[PDB]
Design a protein around this ligand. Structure first.
Ligand SMILES: *[C@@H]1O[C@H](CO[C@@H]2O[C@@H](C)[C@@H](O)[C@@H](O)[C@@H]2O)[C@@H](O)[C@H](O)[C@H]1NC(C)=O
Ligand SMILES: *[C@@H]1O[C@H](CO[C@@H]2O[C@@H](C)[C@@H](O)[C@@H](O)[C@@H]2O)[C@@H](O)[C@H](O)[C@H]1NC(C)=O
Ligand SMILES: *[C@@H]1O[C@H](CO)[C@@H](O)[C@H](O)[C@H]1NC(C)=O
Ligand SMILES: [Cl-]
Ligand SMILES: [Zn+2]
Lengths: 12, 591
């Protein structure tokens, strides 16, 4: 799981 | 105004804190992906948890600045991203039920397995068992068993869950003042407040339908050629005027026709260009591949990779080996790739470094604007890099191909046919699937004909027919990952069109001579300049403007894709001159 800069902001 | 000034201050402080927390989460996730450990699992979990809680608080804080009182559009964009209520607008009961349904559908899909009926302890997963059957089996009934067993075992589980999921997602969307969940998804292309660059959510439907109408002739000719080949591959099972049975298309759904290549290759005595052996002969290594990619990007005027990139990237296998481009912030850019010395990994290196190049271009933007202009931009940017890097001209330049090498027309046709099976084949599939979901969310398809309409559309739009009848206990759409895992799908259509638009424009900027598919943009700083004028925008500007920056037009256009395949289109028309082109929706394997 890693962070995004847009929703959902934390994907797997 | 005071509220707008306070909104700007709030966003500035958000940017600082988000940069810090995002960097820590990105670095923790990178460490886990590079070195799987319980300690790195724990560190990743801690970073992710802090990041998500921070975003929850910042969403609540962003609510204090109504967009109705903001007149700066950039500020408005940043605020809207944080203000999205989403599933929170539902009651805790409905929210909880929706999350349970979502996790359940995901779990059903990822644990799906089908077992030999004559020996039930022999079971197959989607990957690799069933996928292997759907790619490689020439046994009509084995392929039918795999296709039907997957739909029966998984989609039937998913059907009631998917019904409740539609209900709850529609309530969520309407509570956020959208018409329905499909309209909510199409909001991802919306543009307001920019005169001359606006784009409404309904306009996406119109543009997808119009461009699809334009590609219908090429797809019909490809479909007729493939149908003729498949009649040889599966004798007595395919009508000359009929749709293609859904279980004979090379994968579990017919999403791509890639694995039909060896059943349809026009000139099988000509091999396709593979420079793997040349790479090994010249003793290339992963570092060599990525240095060549860096040279390619420099040649159009883009920066070469950072020192931190060369230090911190894992270009060799010690880890999760998915090729990925990481933009961690604070000048930290990495690529994770277990590179092999093979042509595919060379092209994939160009693709991932294209991602990184995009990331570097818009790094100076505010945090929330450090993204692609819309959901389709980033992968299109990646794809054009592979396009240029695989051309014979490019391979000659880097000395992986002989200077006297000349691609004959049979090899050219083989390559374009293989390209079309993946690229063109998936467009009707993608359009039709998303159209079905849009219509379901709209309320235009009653539950009691969900499947009846699905297959009616499969026959009409895609030219594909179910090998056996499916009543409304089935949920065939949900048997594909993106449907059961609640992902919008039209990105694969727009992404495709964009990528050829880009390429054509860049290739015109490079004064390319000859068919578009042979173009290489290497050593064209004018091309790199046109590309960079969009890359640096991030999502600070409407995607329409960002697209115009590269290609001089404000809207999706399929004409460049058609131009790229025009030689294949001509060849196919000649090949099909004694065949039916198109299909009757009336025929079925079981009627
Ligand atoms: C809108 O405001 C811009 C400056 O705002 C600041 O800089 C941008 C990049 C964001 O970080 C934002 O959050 C900051 O508050 C101006 O450059 C721009 O011209 C303004 N809009 C118009 C139409 O003039
Ligand atoms: C968002 O929703 C607000 C009301 O919902 C409240 O906030 C969400 C996050 C949930 O926690 C819910 O329990 C709360 O009652 C509205 O006041 C606000 O205007 C909405 N804004 C938008 C942009 O939809
Ligand atoms: C790019 O330029 C270099 C040096 O000018 C040259 O060696 C290389 O072959 C060129 N490649 C193309 C595709 O023009
Ligand atoms: Cl299906
Ligand atoms: Zn990519």
């Amino acid at each position: 799981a890693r962070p995004l800069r847009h929703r959902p902001w934390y994907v797997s | 105004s005071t509220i707008e000034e306070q909104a700007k201050t709030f966003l500035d402080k958000f940017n600082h804190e988000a940069e810090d927390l995002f960097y820590q989460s990105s670095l923790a996730s990178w460490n886990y992906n590079t070195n799987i450990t319980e300690e790195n699992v724990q560190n990743m979990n801690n970073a992710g948890d802090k990041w998500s809680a921070f975003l929850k608080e910042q969403s609540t804080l962003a609510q204090m600045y109504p967009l109705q009182e903001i007149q700066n559009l950039t500020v408005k964009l940043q605020l809207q991203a944080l203000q999205q209520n989403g599933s929170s607008v539902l009651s805790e009961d409905k929210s909880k039920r929706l999350n349970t349904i979502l996790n359940t559908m995901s779990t059903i899909y990822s644990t799906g397995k089908v077992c030999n009926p004559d020996n039930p302890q022999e079971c197959l997963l989607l990957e690799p068992g069933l996928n292997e059957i759907m790619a490689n089996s020439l046994d009509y009934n084995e392929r039918l068993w795999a296709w039907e067993s997957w739909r029966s075992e998984v989609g039937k589980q998913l059907r009631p869950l998917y019904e409740e999921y539609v209900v709850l997602k529609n309530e969520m969307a309407r509570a956020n003042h959208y018409e329905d969940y499909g309209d909510y998804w199409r909001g991802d292309y919306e543009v307001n407040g920019v005169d001359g660059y606006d784009y409404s959510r309904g306009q996406l439907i119109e543009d997808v339908e119009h461009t699809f109408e334009e590609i219908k002739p090429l797809y019909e000719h490809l479909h007729a050629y493939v149908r003729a080949k498949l009649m040889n591959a599966y004798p007595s099972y395919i009508s000359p005027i009929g749709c293609l049975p859904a279980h004979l298309l090379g994968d579990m759904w017919g999403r791509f026709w890639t694995n039909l290549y060896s059943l349809t290759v026009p000139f099988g005595q000509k091999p396709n260009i593979d420079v793997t052996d040349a790479m090994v002969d010249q003793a290339w290594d992963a570092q060599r591949i990525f240095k060549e990619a860096e040279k390619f990007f420099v040649s159009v005027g883009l920066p070469n990779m950072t020192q931190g990139f060369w230090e911190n990237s894992m270009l060799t296998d010690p880890a999760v080996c998915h090729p990925t481009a990481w933009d961690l912030g604070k000048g930290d850019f990495r690529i994770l790739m277990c590179t092999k010395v093979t042509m595919d990994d060379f092209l994939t290196a160009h693709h991932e470094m294209g991602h990184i190049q995009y990331d570097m271009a818009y790094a100076a933007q505010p945090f929330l604007l450090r993204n692609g202009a819309n959901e389709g931009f980033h992968e299109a940017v990646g794809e054009i890099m592979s396009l240029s890097a695989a051309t014979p001209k490019h391979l000659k330049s880097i000395g992986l191909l002989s200077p006297d090498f000349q691609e004959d027309n049979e090899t050219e046709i083989n390559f374009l046919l293989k390209q079309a099976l993946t690229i063109v084949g998936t467009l009707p599939f993608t359009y039709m699937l998303e159209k079905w979901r849009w219509m379901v969310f709209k309320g235009e398809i009653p539950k009691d004909q969900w499947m009846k309409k699905w297959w009616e559309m499969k026959r009409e739009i895609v030219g594909v027919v179910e090998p056996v009848p499916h009543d409304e206990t089935y949920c065939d759409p949900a048997s594909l990952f993106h449907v059961s895992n609640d992902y919008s799908f039209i990105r694969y259509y727009t992404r495709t069109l964009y990528q050829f638009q880009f390429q054509e424009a860049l290739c015109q900027a490079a004064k390319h001579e000859g068919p578009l598919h042979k173009c290489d943009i290497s050593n064209s700083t004018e091309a790199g300049q046109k590309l960079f004028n969009m890359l640096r925008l991030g999502k600070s500007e409407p995607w329409t403007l960002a697209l115009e920056n590269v290609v001089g037009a404000k809207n999706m256009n399929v004409r460049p894709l058609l131009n790229y395949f025009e030689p294949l289109f001509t060849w196919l028309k000649d090949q099909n001159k004694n065949s039916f082109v198109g299909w009757s929706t009336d025929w079925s394997p079981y009627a």
